[PDB]
């Protein structure tokens, strides 16, 4: 859970609290890209929005509806030994917190829901583009009138339709009156804790940016009903959403390595240093996005951003010796100390000063066929690189790797600008 909170802690109790969740199915990227963009680009000014951007991260990493079965059928009866049991308890505890008032759960769904049968794509059994409640009223909730809230949220969404077929409709699943097998989902659990709970479906028939657009419209519609004041730093239209999903300023930082751009990496990065003795899901990974991760695939390690494959790492596992903190480098004739893990911009040249006990391998530069070269003490320019070794498709970013005996001492990237 990540908090979207006012800057003044005192403002947290001055409006309602919403819990916003997505990605309970790992192949529903509209939901988890919406929670991502909300975390990255919105501000909450009073009250609080608690966000679990992806409920089923292992499944997301494999572009899969649910590696351990349908996680959204696990909120009622559940075997204590179910692999998702611990996760389910964490989620139920968030839902049932006294400080939470409302719950919004995002999904992507086939076709377009209609309350009367129109055709195979548009009918009451389809799920796309509807706003869903379990029943019209939850007695004892802060906001018991789920129907009024839903109808008003639907008004907001429907003021912004991209095409008439995308019109949102209310779906009331009357869950408590239905079969036992229909009562196993997240929002029904939530209403049983006297929370107002809603699900938003965006149609799987839409491109990703349009799915995310509709999720964001539903989030904004509901925040307006709850009187949780907010801002965003962009205009909400599909082009603008697309631009932010596909933002060139997105980065990932693996372990103690430098930040790397997410987009336009080469599709495969070879001899890529990773810490040894560390299970892939335990390798530290930081990003300015909230849906980035690593996952093993055969002997490769995939860098995932939601369902998007950003690169395939071909790793070599090695001890990450943390002793080396900085390196004396000359950049465009200007001598300086460069921190291990940095990205440095180079207009013309660089030069690494020689070090006792440390060997530098500039990846893409060579002066011999030596397998473990020391390339400190060379003045290096763009023309000296075999471009195929660049980190990026643009052939501008190169790795410098440092070694102390048989251990890895760190990496610095150079970016030719
Ligand atoms: Ca922004
Ligand atoms: Ca779903
Ligand atoms: Ca080299």
From TrEMBL:
It comes from the Bacteria. Zn(2+) 5 binds at residue 242. Ca(2+) 3 binds at residues 41, 233. Zn(2+) 8 binds at residues 361-362, 365, 375. Zn(2+) 1 binds at residues 28, 107. Ca(2+) 4 binds at residues 152, 155. Residues 247-319 form the Carboxypeptidase M99 beta-barrel domain. Zn(2+) 7 binds at residue 353. Keywords: Calcium, Metal-binding, Zinc. Zn(2+) 4 binds at residues 167, 169. Pfam families: Peptidase_M99, Peptidase_M99_C, Peptidase_M99_m. Residues 1-246 form the D,L-carboxypeptidase peptidase domain. GO terms for molecular function: metal ion binding. This is Conserved hypothetical secreted protein. Ca(2+) 2 binds at residues 25, 28, 107. Zn(2+) 6 binds at residues 299-300.
């Amino acid at each position: 859970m990540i908090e979207k909170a006012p800057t003044n802690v005192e403002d947290r109790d001055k409006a309602p609290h919403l819990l916003l969740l997505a990605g309970i199915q790992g192949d529903e990227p509209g939901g988890f890209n919406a929670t991502n963009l909300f975390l990255m680009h919105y501000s909450v000014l009073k009250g609080l929005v608690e966000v679990v951007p992806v409920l089923n991260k292992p499944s997301m990493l494999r572009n899969h509806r649910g590696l351990y079965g349908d996680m959204n059928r696990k909120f009622a009866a559940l075997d204590k030994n179910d692999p998702e049991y611990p996760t389910i308890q964490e989620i139920k505890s968030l839902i049932a917190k006294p400080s939470i008032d409302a719950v919004l759960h995002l999904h992507d769904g086939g076709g377009y829901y209609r309350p009367v049968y129109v055709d195979a794509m548009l009918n009451p059994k389809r799920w796309g583009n509807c706003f869903i409640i379990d029943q019209d009223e939850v007695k004892g909730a802060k906001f018991p009138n789920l129907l009024a809230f839903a109808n008003n949220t639907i008004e907001s969404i429907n003021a912004h339709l991209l095409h008439p077929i995308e019109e949102y409709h209310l779906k009331n699943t009357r869950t408590a009156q239905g079969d036992t097998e229909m009562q196993k989902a997240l929002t029904f659990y939530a209403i049983n804790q006297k929370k107002s709970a809603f699900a938003n479906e965006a149609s799987k028939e839409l491109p990703l940016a349009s799915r995310v657009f509709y999720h964001l419209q539903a989030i904004e519609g509901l925040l307006n009903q709850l009187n949780i004041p907010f801002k965003r730093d962009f205009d909400l239209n599909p082009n603008s959403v697309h631009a932010l999903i596909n933002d060139k300023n997105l980065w990932a930082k693996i372990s103690s390595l430098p930040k790397m751009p997410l987009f336009n990496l080469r599709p495969k990065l070879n001899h890529f240093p990773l810490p040894h003795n560390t299970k892939i899901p335990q390798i530290p990974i930081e990003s300015n996005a909230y849906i980035v991760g690593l996952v093993k695939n055969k002997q490769e390690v995939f860098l995932k951003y939601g369902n998007k494959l950003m690169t395939r790492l071909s790793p070599f596992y090695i001890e990450f010796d943390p002793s080396l903190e900085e390196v004396k480098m000359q950049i465009d004739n200007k001598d300086q100390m460069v921190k291990i893990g940095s990205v440095v911009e180079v207009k013309e040249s660089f030069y690494i000063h020689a070090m006792d006990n440390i060997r530098a391998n500039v990846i893409g530069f060579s002066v011999s066929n030596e397998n473990k070269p020391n390339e400190a003490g060379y003045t290096i320019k763009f023309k000296d690189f075999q471009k195929r070794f660049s980190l990026d498709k643009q052939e501008r970013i190169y790795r410098i790797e440092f070694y102390k005996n048989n251990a890895f001492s760190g990496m610095i990237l150079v970016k030719f600008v």
